[PDB]
């Protein structure tokens, strides 16, 4: 229902943001202990 510009800009949007607070969360959760299960 919602236009192009709209879509793109909420893909980018949640992407980034997405991006970001999985660094932040890994990278302060790693600092902070380490990791449970190996990757």
Same mark, same amino acid.
């Given at each position: 229902? *919602?236009? !192009?510009?709209?879509?793109?800009?909420? +893909? *980018?949007?949640?992407? %980034?943001?997405? =991006?970001?607070? *999985?660094? %932040?969360?890994? +990278?302060? !959760?790693?600092? =902070?202990?380490?990791?449970?299960?190996?990757?």
């Amino acid at each position: 229902m *919602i236009s !192009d510009e709209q879509l793109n800009s909420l +893909a *980018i949007t949640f992407g %980034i943001v997405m =991006m970001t607070l *999985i660094v %932040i969360y890994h +990278a302060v !959760d790693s600092t =902070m202990s380490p990791k449970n299960r190996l990757e």
